[PDB]
Write a protein that binds this DNA or RNA. Structure first.
Lengths: 128, 97, 25, 63, 216
RNA sequence: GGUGAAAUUCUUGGAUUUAUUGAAGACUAACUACUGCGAAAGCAUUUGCCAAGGACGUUUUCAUUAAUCAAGAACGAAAGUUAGGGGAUCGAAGAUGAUCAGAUACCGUCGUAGUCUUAACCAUAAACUAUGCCGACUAGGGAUCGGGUGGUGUUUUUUUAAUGACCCACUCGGCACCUUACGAGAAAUCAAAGUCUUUGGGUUCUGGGGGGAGUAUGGUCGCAAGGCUGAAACUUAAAGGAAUUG
RNA sequence: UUGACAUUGUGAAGAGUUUC
């Protein structure tokens, strides 16, 4: 169990996908990338394949710096928002497990309130 | 004319409840109203489970799961085909599928 | 048209008629 | 290049709006532990192999 | 054109004595230069870790601990008890409809001067022939329950330090004691001590710091 | 960033995101249900004080004290207001970006009032169960809250217990739900919307085709907003509601 | 008002022999 553990923070929205990495300390972050970085379309920003490559290059830098194992922590945006993760979450996550960094200790720390402040839509909402 | 003894859903004794925000359309609507659906799923979906089981320290460790209590808006649901229209008696019934 | 809207149109028209007759003294 | 092959275990069915696409399950033919779903273009029956560029996607319903 | 990753040094995170797997892991810190300190940038740090990893026990999978950097020493750094937390899928599994969810709290000081807010939780339960489907309780029920829970919380945090508190937390003494106490009123399944937070801490006290550390 | 998709917007000032800590003010999730309370409006973390209130129980007390009630009175969402305090969030306004024939809107970005409370006001809403109150009676079932009766019941372990919960059975009072329509109905549908051409239990109030019209005036309350009451000519043979077929 | 020079001494520590 000598492999050093970092932590991979997966924020999976539908506007993009964040694969952030730190050590077990949130301070001194290691790796950080998106599909908003890995393609220029502005529509598929959060999409799986882009977040797939996001995780690919994350693991690349994890090796280049010498990080070998990870505890993973996923979240949607949260607060009072959709509260559902984006597909980039699974895509980058599976691709992490595939790229072969050791994986573990899964959880959803997506922030959840005690009935907190109001929302966008004004009682009647983003009607389409 | 009247279409539901509910008049939509069951307040039927108090006069008031509190509202919520629909997860998609955001619409403030009362809580005894406010279509509800639990949703239990995994994070490790049926093939990534296998990938993780190989890539995993802590053998067998666990399958945590995502638990979400979706408060739906009416027409939002209707277009989501959470439900569809039903005939008179299919409306009368209150049983799940 | 909407009844709330007809009613408000009348609300304004009445406020206006009042303004007129008050200027009239 | 990182090509792979996979033989069809099951033609899942024709999804996609126009009836052109069809969902399939395929064993990756190098690891029978690997059975993955994908989508195809053309006419297909069982026992045939697809040449897969990405072994990772496993797409879903199509329209 | 700089690449600080070939500049940063590495350090070994070590746990207090009450833990078994005390070799917490490794971390990266920039080299302590002139007029700026790696050790201070490390002192200002904390790290969350699972109790199953702290203890080796897979029964300890859901409890997780913040551990605060107190002392840095020659490629190593000693961590302090910063607080415990409780994973979320477990919570949302536990919390189900057709029952009454209950929570209790209290703030109190330890024997030593550690101000701590503590939070425990429980849920109502049916009983073995109870054909009705919810099994809710009453106002007096919940009130006396929260009362006694707060009572016991204050008692045992009084008769303790961070050390004694954690040494009881790991074996889950507290849940069993509250069960013993609150059984009189109601079934009340699913006792846990959900959360704990350090509000105030005494002066640094390197002596007892090393005392609890200063081994392994 | 944000979306159907875009853009505005923010980013060597290193944002977004990582993390430690603190503040602000906020709302009280999962418990949250065909369940509770309350005159209705409405009412939820925690705890203490204040007084109040129902139901039940009660071999307590007084003896007709009461039911409905024009006039008169206390309450009354949200919006709104005066003066302070407070103003995280959202957000009519407002400015912008999109789209489109235009968009003065939906949608994106920002954001003022207020949103919070305070001392005073305003007295309106689908304030809806669109079903007046008081009292009589008629037809089954099972859930169920609270109170209540019983159990050589269950469980709780101790040495039975006591108790606590739980189950069975029964009873008051509530929410209500289901079958049948006996009855009612225009038809929907209703154990009350039944007891009604076999036309009467008590009582308050309301309505007479539609438009004009809650308009106009006047009165009157209100700081205002406005409210209460409240027309008329004139025009009109259709409007209207239930169900079916298309 | 900004900066300098002196009043203006006593020790340290450390970034780019440095003098900040």
């Amino acid at each position: 169990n000598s492999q050093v553990f970092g932590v991979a923070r997966i924020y999976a929205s539908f506007n993009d996908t964040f694969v952030h990495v730190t050590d077990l300390s949130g301070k001194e972050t290691i790796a950080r990338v998106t599909g908003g970085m890995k393609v220029k379309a502005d529509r598929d920003e959060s999409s799986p394949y882009a977040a797939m490559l996001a995780a690919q290059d994350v693991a690349a830098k994890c090796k280049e710096v010498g990080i070998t194992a990870v505890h993973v922590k996923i979240r949607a945006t949260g607060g009072t928002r959709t509260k559902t993760p984006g597909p980039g979450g699974q895509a980058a996550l599976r691709a992490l497990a595939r790229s072969g960094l050791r994986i573990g200790r899964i959880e959803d720390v997506t922030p959840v309130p005690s009935d907190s402040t109001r929302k966008k839509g004004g009682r009647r909402g983003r009607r389409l | 004319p009247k279409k539901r003894a509910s008049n939509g859903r069951n307040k039927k004794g108090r006069g008031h409840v509190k509202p919520v925000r629909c997860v998609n359309c955001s619409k403030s609507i009362p809580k005894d109203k406010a279509i509800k659906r639990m949703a239990i799923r995994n994070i490790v979906e049926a093939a990534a489970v296998r990938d993780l089981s190989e890539a995993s320290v802590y053998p067998e460790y666990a399958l945590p799961k995502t638990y979400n209590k979706l408060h739906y808006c009416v027409s939002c649901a209707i277009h989501a085909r959470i439900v569809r229209v039903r005939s008179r008696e299919d409306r009368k019934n209150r049983a799940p599928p | 048209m909407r009844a709330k809207w007809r009613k408000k149109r009348t609300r304004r028209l009445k406020r206006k008629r009042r303004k007129v007759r008050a200027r009239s003294k | 290049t990182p090509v792979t092959l996979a033989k069809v275990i099951k033609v899942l069915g024709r999804t996609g709006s126009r009836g052109g696409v069809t969902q399939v399950r395929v064993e990756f033919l190098e690891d029978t532990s690997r059975t993955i779903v994908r989508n195809v273009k053309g006419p297909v029956r069982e026992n045939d192999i697809l040449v897969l560029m990405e072994s990772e996607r496993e797409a879903r319903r199509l329209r | 054109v700089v690449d600080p990753f070939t500049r940063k040094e590495w350090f070994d995170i070590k746990a207090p004595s009450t833990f078994e797997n005390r070799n917490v892991g490794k971390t990266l810190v920039n080299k302590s230069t002139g007029l700026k300190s790696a050790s201070d940038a490390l002192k200002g740090r904390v790290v969350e870790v699972c109790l199953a990893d702290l203890q080796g026990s897979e029964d300890h999978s859901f409890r997780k601990i913040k551990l605060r950097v107190d002392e840095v020493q020659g490629k190593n750094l000693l961590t302090n008890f910063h607080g415990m937390d409780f994973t979320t899928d477990k919570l949302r599994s536990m919390v189900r409809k057709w029952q009454t969810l209950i929570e209790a709290n209290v703030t109190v000081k330890t024997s030593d001067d550690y101000v701590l807010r503590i939070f425990a939780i429980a849920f109502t339960r049916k009983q073995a022939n109870q054909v009705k489907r919810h099994s809710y309780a009453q106002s007096s029920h919940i009130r006396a329950i929260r009362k006694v829970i707060s009572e016991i919380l204050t008692k045992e945090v009084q008769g303790s330090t961070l050390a004694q508190l954690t040494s009881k937390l790991i074996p889950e003494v507290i849940n069993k004691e509250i069960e013993n106490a609150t059984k009189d009123i109601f079934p009340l399944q699913n006792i846990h001590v959900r959360k704990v937070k350090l509000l105030k801490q005494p002066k640094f006290d390197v002596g007892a710091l090393m005392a609890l550390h200063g081994e392994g």
